[PDB]
Design a protein around this ligand. Structure first.
Ligand SMILES: Nc1ncnc2c1[nH]c(=O)n2[C@@H]1O[C@H](CO)[C@@H](O)[C@H]1O
Lengths: 207, 207
């Protein structure tokens, strides 16, 4: 199936098409039917393999636009590094032209990111340390998150973000949809699946 | 997604709606995009109903009509029991009205099944002992198989059909597509996948 063969808003297909994105990778192909219907998923694939559209498209399709200034984000993607946050935020912005995406990360001051969140956000793509910083401050509000994504969870684990990732998830509504991406499914990922996910479907494309 | 949301022939969709089936189960939904494009997959779902269309619809879509008398089957579905051979043959028959489906199984004489195979078949649904018997007799010809399916591989193992299943798989063209369904993924299934499957995606919906 091409992306056109999935039930996606015309605008989203248009955006995809204009970016030379036509073909889901195997993990995306298998993930989309479940993810588009709001189901929790665990995606297991070799690091670097393309899987962004397995969550980007479900977020884009699920979230309608909003203009409510100061509005809280309805999607949260946690990722290990500034580089990935910028990369993921970028791709999501492209596939979801109707949504305001804000990247959040450490290694810089608070102001700018803080003022974006204050202006409003539809999706936040964040590193866990900085995200937790903004939560306990009261700046990042996670009480309206409908979709939470854990990107490169193995690396988030190796970096020592376990406790931060869990605190952030715990701050979101349990009724949310959750998508977890782990290359090796270590003990921590299994604990996440058990505690923070609802009957997650596992898709493993390692071969 | 509903069945109508997948790229299926209108007459196949008609057959489904005629049977009162509009919505894939989670295993079927996740499997369809890859199975329809001819990829190998391991579907981990509970034994019993709920997965047939994940292989029946790809067989229906992939195989064009043929009228050749004495034609050899282009799909082979193995089931662990005689009861399931009958059931799955009936289910496949209903969603592939353009194909001739022939059930093969012990617990009765050889006459009628032999007659059916000699007249020709597009898909064979079989228990492994009887299928292998017919192979040895030269009545069942597997040289044109394009899709092989193992439905409920765990029970094949527990009934002690491993040698027969492997002999049958070995008798088919490796160029074929292979779909394997099993609830628990024991060592034998893993070694089957390694020997007889091509980079299969694993989809596990076990709750
Ligand atoms: N279906 C797809 N087609 C092309 N590029 C993709 C893709 N999915 C996906 O995630 N990518 C991109 O490729 C990168 C690495 O493969 C990802 O980080 C994305 O930037």
């Amino acid at each position: 199936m091409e992306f056109k063969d999935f039930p996606l808003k015309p605008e989203i297909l248009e955006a995809l098409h204009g970016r030379g994105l036509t073909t889901p990778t195997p993990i995306e192909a298998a993930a989309l039917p479940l993810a588009l219907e709001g189901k929790d998923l665990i995606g297991q694939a070799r690091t670097g393999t393309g899987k962004t559209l397995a969550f980007a498209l479900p977020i884009a399709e699920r979230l309608a636009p909003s203009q409510e200034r100061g509005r809280k984000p309805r999607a949260l993607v946690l990722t290990p590094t500034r580089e990935l946050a910028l990369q993921v935020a970028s791709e999501l912005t492209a596939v979801a032209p109707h949504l305001k995406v804000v990247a959040v990360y450490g290694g810089t001051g608070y102001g700018k990111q803080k003022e974006a969140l204050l202006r409003g956000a539809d999706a936040v793509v964040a590193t866990p340390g900085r995200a937790l910083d903004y939560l306990r401050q009261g700046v990042l509000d996670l009480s309206r998150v409908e979709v939470a994504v854990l990107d490169e969870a193995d690396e988030m684990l190796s970096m020592g973000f376990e406790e931060e990732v869990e605190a952030l998830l715990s701050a979101t509504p349990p009724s949310r949809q959750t998508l977890l991406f782990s290359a090796t499914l270590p003990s921590w990922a299994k604990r996440l699946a058990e505690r923070y996910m609802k009957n997650p479907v596992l898709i493993n494309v390692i071969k």
